[PDB]
Design a protein around this nucleic acid. Structure first.
Ligand SMILES: [Zn+2]
Lengths: 114, 23, 181, 83, 69
RNA sequence: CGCGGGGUGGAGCAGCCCGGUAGCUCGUCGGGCUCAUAACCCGAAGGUCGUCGGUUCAAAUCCGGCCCCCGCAACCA
RNA sequence: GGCGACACACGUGCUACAAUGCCCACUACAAAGCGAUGCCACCCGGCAACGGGGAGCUAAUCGCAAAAAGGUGGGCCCAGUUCGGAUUGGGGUCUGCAACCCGACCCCAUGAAGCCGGAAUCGCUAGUAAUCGCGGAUCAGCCAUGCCGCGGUGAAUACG
RNA sequence: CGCCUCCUAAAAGGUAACGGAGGCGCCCAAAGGUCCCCUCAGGCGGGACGGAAAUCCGCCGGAGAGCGCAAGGGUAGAAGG
């Protein structure tokens, strides 16, 4: 379908774009503007030429699925290499943005371990 | 929810202004 | 038999290009595609969904040729598979279906690959025989996402008349296999 | 981060000592207390022992660490786990 | 070929996002494809398709040189 | 050493006969209740089934060896 | 530099697990307070934070400042979702000499657990509870979901 | 305590010991007959899950595999699939 994935036919295009990794609510409301496409249209109601236009536009305006993930890991991996505190935090699986490690680090630490 | 910045709800609860809650 | 553009590319340019590149004394000295083997070592249907013939149907769609079933050559404790148990499908595409399937592969299958930076330039037998693998089966245009239910990858063993991997990768390169390196 | 409209902050004594070795050839590992300071592209190839609060941690400044603060690389804390 | 088991092949029209038609043989006469060889990144000079930076780091230190020396 | 039996989580025992998956009580951890402790309640964890080889696709679970422990005999004088 | 660590454990709170809902655009309706190196109107730029202009305001008169929920209209259709916003990558604004540890805020993307919570346990008898928002202290800035207050709407139940 | 395998057992066979090792007290309606077809184990390299070891490919292999079960004999120019 689209760059790496598919949007459900039964959903509007706005939510449709969002299922792409690297596409949130913001750009979703944007590609419709830059492609002049009705947001209210379901994916089951989308025309080929509009889609390929959509496909052509968005899939080069940004990198979304694989090309986007690599930069993240590239950024993250290089931090481990540079030994930065940020990278230092990642190598411990700890909250890298200065959060409080003493309590409430579950989202970064997952299951609690007595 | 209230704690979501991107919602105008959040910037109300958070008490801020931005792309999603102008003045 | 039937006409296939890619094979036509083999005769038209690939043959003379290889001959120039190597000066083969005889045209039988130049590489060729013996066959193209397709494997799916499922390892899942052997226990449950033992009629996953639907997967064989997918192979038939991609190949126009129903694959034969491969069973366990012996039982295993770890691999929960008693001997004589279907564990993987297999089809052997040859001349016409060979060039056809390969043509759909390069023209569509590879460019549909997620983050396809190219083929391994190293996945060679050593005898001039290339192998590779897939993690899903919805790459091929015959297969649609609607018809797909589970991602069965596969393996492809393209065998070549050539003796070295040199002339092999030379050939498929002339065939335009996009090598990631 | 620091307002790029505002200048990119680096301590005067730090940068001058940097350019000095840039003037007088790469040498002379530099003690420093300016963890708040930002690495500058000129700093690449230099080695500096940044102070952690107790010691000066010698950090070799490469290009790969230019756009950062110096305190990032002298970890001011010691954690080895539990048990 | 065992006459009755193999799904019969036909001429098959490939249609890319380029609208690229590619005549082949398949079990579907008319077929569309989001991608072809004439559009794939790795075939289109790699094209960068979003980002031509190519490991932008490190610098890329623009907004720099504001130091007083 | 001659015979029979056994040697499973921290403890005591189960699963062995029928090899495809080891369970119970206690105990431990955490929490709850209490002014606190015990009791109690909730939750949680956790077992080369002596040891070594073979049999097996697979052995606690089969086989054989060794070790330990146990019971029985070690006799006619 | 540390007080911000972090295998863990407990308390107190906030946000949710959604349709009596979420989101969006418009229209309301407060109180109580603060403000001269502060409120800053209004203009412009900028997605925005914010920045540049810049009036008034020394205070019932200027501003902070929109109250919010509510009403209106639309979308969403039960979805780990247009719920959820945690984490993280990047790009920025602002204060501050200096935001790495160790600020806040704006923007994109990422979109975690979570489907009402065991044992158990808490507050509340009326404008109370619940929910909605506003102000102030400290303070350059803020780690404030806290605290102290203000108002909006507004319950059930007490046999004993 | 009966029968099978090997050594004992002295190049015929047979050959004892409370000698040294293991087995059997069945099983297969196909594990039987016949025709036709194929050839293993193993090693290396390549191969999504997937591994040491699934299935696939190529390459090297006389049999070291397998041949229902003990051992031996026999065996792919099949008794093996
Ligand atoms: Zn194309």
């Amino acid at each position: 379908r689209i760059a790496g994935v598919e949007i459900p036919r039964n959903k509007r295009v706005d939510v449709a774009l969002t299922y792409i990794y690297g596409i949130g609510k913001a750009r979703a409301k944007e590609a419709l503007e830059k492609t002049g496409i009705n947001p209210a249209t379901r994916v089951k109601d989308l025309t080929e030429a509009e889609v390929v236009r959509l496909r052509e536009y968005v899939e080069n305006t940004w990198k979304l699925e694989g090309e986007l993930r690599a930069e993240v890991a590239a950024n993250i991996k290089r931090l481990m290499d540079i030994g930065c505190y940020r990278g230092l935090r990642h190598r411990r699986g700890l909250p890298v943005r200065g959060q409080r490690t003493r309590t409430n680090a579950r989202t970064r630490k997952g299951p609690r371990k007595t | 929810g209230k704690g979501d910045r991107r919602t105008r709800r959040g910037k109300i609860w958070r008490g801020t202004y931005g792309k999603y809650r102008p003045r | 038999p039937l006409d296939v553009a890619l094979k036509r590319k083999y005769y038209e340019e690939v043959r003379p290009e290889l001959i120039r590149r190597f000066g083969y004394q005889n045209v039988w000295e130049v590489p060729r595609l013996e066959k193209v083997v397709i494997n799916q070592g499922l390892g899942e249907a052997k226990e449950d969904a033992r009629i996953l013939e639907k997967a064989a149907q997918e192979l038939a769609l991609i190949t126009g040729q129903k694959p034969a079933v491969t069973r366990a050559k012996k039982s295993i404790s770890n691999f929960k598979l008693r001997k004589g148990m279907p564990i993987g499908l297999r089809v052997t595409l040859r001349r016409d279906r060979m060039w056809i399937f390969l043509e759909k592969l390069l023209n569509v299958a590879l460019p549909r690959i997620r983050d396809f930076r190219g083929l391994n330039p190293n996945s060679f037998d050593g005898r001039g025989n290339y192998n590779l693998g897939l993690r899903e089966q919805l790459i091929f245009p015959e297969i649609t996402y609607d018809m797909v239910d589970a991602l069965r990858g596969m393996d492809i063993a393209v065998v070549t008349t050539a003796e070295t991997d040199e002339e092999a990768r030379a050939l498929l390169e002339l065939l335009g296999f996009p090598f990631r390196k | 981060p620091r307002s790029l409209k505002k200048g990119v902050f680096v301590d005067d004594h730090l940068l001058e000592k940097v350019l000095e070795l840039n003037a007088k050839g790469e040498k002379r590992l530099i003690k420093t207390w300016s963890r708040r300071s930002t690495i500058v592209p000129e700093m690449v190839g230099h080695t500096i022992a940044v102070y952690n609060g107790k010691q000066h941690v010698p950090v070799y400044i490469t290009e790969n660490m230019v756009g950062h603060k110096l305190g990032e690389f002298a970890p001011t804390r010691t954690y080895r786990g539990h048990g | 070929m065992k006459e009755g088991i193999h799904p019969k092949l036909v001429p098959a029209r490939i249609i890319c996002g380029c609208g690229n038609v590619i005549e082949t043989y398949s079990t579907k006469p008319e077929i569309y494809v989001e991608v072809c060889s004439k559009c794939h990144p790795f075939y289109t000079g790699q094209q960068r398709f979003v980002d031509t930076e190519g490991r932008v780091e490190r610098f890329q230190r623009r907004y720099g040189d504001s130091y007083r020396k």
